[PDB]
mmCIF file of C-alpha atoms in Angstrom:
data_model
loop_
_atom_site.group_PDB
_atom_site.id
_atom_site.type_symbol
_atom_site.label_atom_id
_atom_site.label_comp_id
_atom_site.label_asym_id
_atom_site.label_seq_id
_atom_site.Cartn_x
_atom_site.Cartn_y
_atom_site.Cartn_z
ATOM 1 C CA UNK A 1 -14.933 0.738 13.813
ATOM 2 C CA UNK A 2 -14.975 -3.063 13.837
ATOM 3 C CA UNK A 3 -15.247 -3.205 10.048
ATOM 4 C CA UNK A 4 -12.421 -0.742 9.401
ATOM 5 C CA UNK A 5 -9.967 -2.578 11.650
ATOM 6 C CA UNK A 6 -10.707 -5.844 9.834
ATOM 7 C CA UNK A 7 -10.398 -4.049 6.496
ATOM 8 C CA UNK A 8 -6.884 -2.842 7.282
ATOM 9 C CA UNK A 9 -5.902 -6.117 8.943
ATOM 10 C CA UNK A 10 -6.849 -7.656 5.597
ATOM 11 C CA UNK A 11 -5.441 -5.112 3.130
ATOM 12 C CA UNK A 12 -2.190 -4.344 4.961
ATOM 13 C CA UNK A 13 -1.232 -7.970 5.655
ATOM 14 C CA UNK A 14 1.016 -8.948 2.729
ATOM 15 C CA UNK A 15 -0.157 -12.544 3.150
ATOM 16 C CA UNK A 16 -3.342 -11.492 1.326
ATOM 17 C CA UNK A 17 -1.411 -9.847 -1.525
ATOM 18 C CA UNK A 18 -2.794 -12.106 -4.250
ATOM 19 C CA UNK A 19 -6.444 -11.532 -3.300
ATOM 20 C CA UNK A 20 -6.638 -7.879 -2.285
ATOM 21 C CA UNK A 21 -4.015 -5.138 -2.292
ATOM 22 C CA UNK A 22 -3.270 -1.446 -2.728
ATOM 23 C CA UNK A 23 -3.012 -0.574 -6.428
ATOM 24 C CA UNK A 24 0.398 -0.232 -8.064
ATOM 25 C CA UNK A 25 -0.486 2.918 -9.993
ATOM 26 C CA UNK A 26 -3.061 4.782 -7.937
ATOM 27 C CA UNK A 27 -4.572 5.114 -4.471
ATOM 28 C CA UNK A 28 -7.205 2.399 -4.712
ATOM 29 C CA UNK A 29 -7.808 -1.039 -3.240
ATOM 30 C CA UNK A 30 -7.866 -3.845 -5.781
ATOM 31 C CA UNK A 31 -9.614 -7.203 -5.626
ATOM 32 C CA UNK A 32 -8.137 -8.947 -8.725
ATOM 33 C CA UNK A 33 -10.674 -11.782 -8.596
ATOM 34 C CA UNK A 34 -13.993 -11.457 -6.739
ATOM 35 C CA UNK A 35 -14.747 -15.179 -6.552
ATOM 36 C CA UNK A 36 -11.288 -16.090 -5.234
ATOM 37 C CA UNK A 37 -11.482 -13.279 -2.663
ATOM 38 C CA UNK A 38 -14.856 -14.517 -1.393
ATOM 39 C CA UNK A 39 -13.548 -18.098 -1.266
ATOM 40 C CA UNK A 40 -10.119 -17.602 0.328
ATOM 41 C CA UNK A 41 -10.083 -14.351 2.306
ATOM 42 C CA UNK A 42 -13.571 -13.221 3.302
ATOM 43 C CA UNK A 43 -14.221 -16.280 5.535
ATOM 44 C CA UNK A 44 -11.041 -15.513 7.487
ATOM 45 C CA UNK A 45 -12.058 -12.000 8.521
ATOM 46 C CA UNK A 46 -15.827 -11.953 8.033
ATOM 47 C CA UNK A 47 -17.617 -15.101 9.162
ATOM 48 C CA UNK A 48 -20.993 -15.792 7.542
ATOM 49 C CA UNK A 49 -20.702 -12.982 4.996
ATOM 50 C CA UNK A 50 -20.857 -12.499 1.222
ATOM 51 C CA UNK A 51 -19.488 -10.020 -1.333
ATOM 52 C CA UNK A 52 -22.554 -7.773 -1.454
ATOM 53 C CA UNK A 53 -22.515 -7.346 2.321
ATOM 54 C CA UNK A 54 -18.800 -6.547 2.195
ATOM 55 C CA UNK A 55 -19.286 -3.932 -0.525
ATOM 56 C CA UNK A 56 -22.223 -2.414 1.349
ATOM 57 C CA UNK A 57 -19.947 -1.864 4.352
ATOM 58 C CA UNK A 58 -17.130 -0.501 2.171
ATOM 59 C CA UNK A 59 -19.636 1.996 0.761
ATOM 60 C CA UNK A 60 -20.697 3.024 4.264
ATOM 61 C CA UNK A 61 -17.099 3.985 4.964
ATOM 62 C CA UNK A 62 -16.450 5.989 1.809
ATOM 63 C CA UNK A 63 -15.074 3.369 -0.591
ATOM 64 C CA UNK A 64 -16.766 3.013 -3.983
ATOM 65 C CA UNK A 65 -16.220 0.960 -7.129
ATOM 66 C CA UNK A 66 -14.179 2.665 -9.857
ATOM 67 C CA UNK A 67 -15.696 2.837 -13.340
ATOM 68 C CA UNK A 68 -14.010 0.099 -15.341
ATOM 69 C CA UNK A 69 -12.270 0.933 -18.606
ATOM 70 C CA UNK A 70 -13.833 -0.761 -21.626
ATOM 71 C CA UNK A 71 -11.026 -2.648 -23.342
ATOM 72 C CA UNK A 72 -10.373 -3.247 -27.025
ATOM 73 C CA UNK A 73 -12.799 -3.746 -29.885
ATOM 74 C CA UNK A 74 -15.110 -5.790 -27.669
ATOM 75 C CA UNK A 75 -15.484 -3.013 -25.075
ATOM 76 C CA UNK A 76 -14.938 -5.763 -22.524
ATOM 77 C CA UNK A 77 -14.730 -5.609 -18.760
ATOM 78 C CA UNK A 78 -13.636 -8.311 -16.335
ATOM 79 C CA UNK A 79 -16.646 -8.324 -13.988
ATOM 80 C CA UNK A 80 -14.607 -10.223 -11.398
ATOM 81 C CA UNK A 81 -12.052 -7.433 -11.037
ATOM 82 C CA UNK A 82 -13.087 -4.796 -8.508
ATOM 83 C CA UNK A 83 -11.225 -1.596 -7.685
ATOM 84 C CA UNK A 84 -12.319 0.775 -4.925
ATOM 85 C CA UNK A 85 -11.472 4.422 -4.316
ATOM 86 C CA UNK A 86 -12.221 6.576 -1.298
ATOM 87 C CA UNK A 87 -14.226 9.797 -1.530
ATOM 88 C CA UNK A 88 -11.381 11.133 0.634
ATOM 89 C CA UNK B 1 11.709 -1.952 -13.665
ATOM 90 C CA UNK B 2 10.293 1.575 -13.830
ATOM 91 C CA UNK B 3 9.873 1.681 -10.057
ATOM 92 C CA UNK B 4 13.534 1.008 -9.292
ATOM 93 C CA UNK B 5 14.655 3.821 -11.582
ATOM 94 C CA UNK B 6 12.309 6.240 -9.860
ATOM 95 C CA UNK B 7 13.512 4.993 -6.478
ATOM 96 C CA UNK B 8 17.132 5.836 -7.288
ATOM 97 C CA UNK B 9 16.329 9.142 -8.995
ATOM 98 C CA UNK B 10 14.609 9.949 -5.696
ATOM 99 C CA UNK B 11 17.105 8.604 -3.147
ATOM 100 C CA UNK B 12 20.290 9.610 -4.989
ATOM 101 C CA UNK B 13 19.169 13.139 -5.812
ATOM 102 C CA UNK B 14 20.701 15.326 -3.091
ATOM 103 C CA UNK B 15 17.702 17.665 -3.345
ATOM 104 C CA UNK B 16 15.515 15.156 -1.492
ATOM 105 C CA UNK B 17 18.048 14.795 1.351
ATOM 106 C CA UNK B 18 15.763 16.141 4.086
ATOM 107 C CA UNK B 19 12.986 13.678 3.261
ATOM 108 C CA UNK B 20 14.657 10.430 2.231
ATOM 109 C CA UNK B 21 18.313 9.405 2.281
ATOM 110 C CA UNK B 22 20.844 6.629 2.712
ATOM 111 C CA UNK B 23 21.497 6.136 6.433
ATOM 112 C CA UNK B 24 24.695 7.412 8.028
ATOM 113 C CA UNK B 25 25.240 4.098 9.797
ATOM 114 C CA UNK B 26 24.218 0.882 8.094
ATOM 115 C CA UNK B 27 23.093 0.342 4.507
ATOM 116 C CA UNK B 28 19.468 1.407 4.701
ATOM 117 C CA UNK B 29 17.182 4.067 3.272
ATOM 118 C CA UNK B 30 15.688 6.422 5.813
ATOM 119 C CA UNK B 31 12.462 8.405 5.644
ATOM 120 C CA UNK B 32 12.765 10.702 8.719
ATOM 121 C CA UNK B 33 9.113 11.756 8.527
ATOM 122 C CA UNK B 34 6.482 9.738 6.636
ATOM 123 C CA UNK B 35 3.945 12.565 6.382
ATOM 124 C CA UNK B 36 6.451 15.107 5.026
ATOM 125 C CA UNK B 37 7.758 12.540 2.542
ATOM 126 C CA UNK B 38 4.249 11.842 1.216
ATOM 127 C CA UNK B 39 3.564 15.580 0.953
ATOM 128 C CA UNK B 40 6.868 16.738 -0.556
ATOM 129 C CA UNK B 41 8.567 13.909 -2.441
ATOM 130 C CA UNK B 42 6.165 11.135 -3.387
ATOM 131 C CA UNK B 43 4.082 13.329 -5.756
ATOM 132 C CA UNK B 44 7.201 14.357 -7.697
ATOM 133 C CA UNK B 45 7.978 10.786 -8.717
ATOM 134 C CA UNK B 46 4.718 8.899 -8.175
ATOM 135 C CA UNK B 47 1.570 10.775 -9.157
ATOM 136 C CA UNK B 48 -1.600 9.567 -7.423
ATOM 137 C CA UNK B 49 0.275 7.238 -5.073
ATOM 138 C CA UNK B 50 0.087 6.897 -1.285
ATOM 139 C CA UNK B 51 2.548 5.595 1.306
ATOM 140 C CA UNK B 52 1.097 2.085 1.472
ATOM 141 C CA UNK B 53 1.347 1.712 -2.303
ATOM 142 C CA UNK B 54 4.963 2.909 -2.220
ATOM 143 C CA UNK B 55 5.882 0.495 0.571
ATOM 144 C CA UNK B 56 4.163 -2.325 -1.318
ATOM 145 C CA UNK B 57 6.465 -1.632 -4.288
ATOM 146 C CA UNK B 58 9.543 -1.401 -2.060
ATOM 147 C CA UNK B 59 8.649 -4.799 -0.607
ATOM 148 C CA UNK B 60 8.404 -6.257 -4.112
ATOM 149 C CA UNK B 61 12.026 -5.275 -4.684
ATOM 150 C CA UNK B 62 13.464 -6.643 -1.459
ATOM 151 C CA UNK B 63 13.212 -3.595 0.787
ATOM 152 C CA UNK B 64 11.591 -4.141 4.174
ATOM 153 C CA UNK B 65 10.942 -1.986 7.234
ATOM 154 C CA UNK B 66 13.627 -2.237 9.920
ATOM 155 C CA UNK B 67 12.670 -3.451 13.388
ATOM 156 C CA UNK B 68 12.024 -0.412 15.564
ATOM 157 C CA UNK B 69 14.253 -0.058 18.618
ATOM 158 C CA UNK B 70 12.122 0.844 21.633
ATOM 159 C CA UNK B 71 13.507 3.923 23.351
ATOM 160 C CA UNK B 72 13.751 4.753 27.027
ATOM 161 C CA UNK B 73 11.408 3.885 29.868
ATOM 162 C CA UNK B 74 8.379 4.446 27.634
ATOM 163 C CA UNK B 75 9.508 1.877 25.063
ATOM 164 C CA UNK B 76 8.556 4.492 22.482
ATOM 165 C CA UNK B 77 8.867 4.494 18.702
ATOM 166 C CA UNK B 78 8.309 7.388 16.319
ATOM 167 C CA UNK B 79 5.753 5.843 13.966
ATOM 168 C CA UNK B 80 6.550 8.522 11.389
ATOM 169 C CA UNK B 81 10.191 7.457 11.039
ATOM 170 C CA UNK B 82 10.664 4.593 8.585
ATOM 171 C CA UNK B 83 13.921 2.811 7.822
ATOM 172 C CA UNK B 84 14.226 0.209 5.069
ATOM 173 C CA UNK B 85 16.833 -2.523 4.626
ATOM 174 C CA UNK B 86 17.349 -4.712 1.578
ATOM 175 C CA UNK B 87 17.223 -8.473 2.127
ATOM 176 C CA UNK B 88 20.450 -8.722 0.111
ATOM 177 C CA UNK B 89 22.409 -6.373 2.390
ATOM 178 C CA UNK B 90 21.990 -7.284 6.055
#
């Protein structure tokens, strides 16, 4: 339960709003920019950790990456934007 | 903003009275029971939304949770009762 408590301490603290937050339209957790999140927030809650380790723990607790929507004529996706949903 | 319009269509519609309403005393919005609100009202205005997401939007528009008054010898607070005040109307 150590991970979960840190997860909520992180997501439900408005001071982290710019790096990770509940989605406006939906019930998912959004990390607008992966690199910024790893730089600014991860070190504050998870010492000596990286994004892959973080995602592996999120997956262990039911949260998975949402399939990104391919945008425009280039069918582009911002690889740095990550959204997670819970199996519920 | 689209959110604000939905907020008022929700709060000022007498049909939602039991789940969310202007307070009798003060100038705040009261959600007597969080769980019931999420089950009965939220879906009608915000499809696929949860309480945290709703509160995040409220905060964006100046509404913040009121400091809970601790009751009796147990210093208790009903975690399911939420009252919101607007920074512009203290």
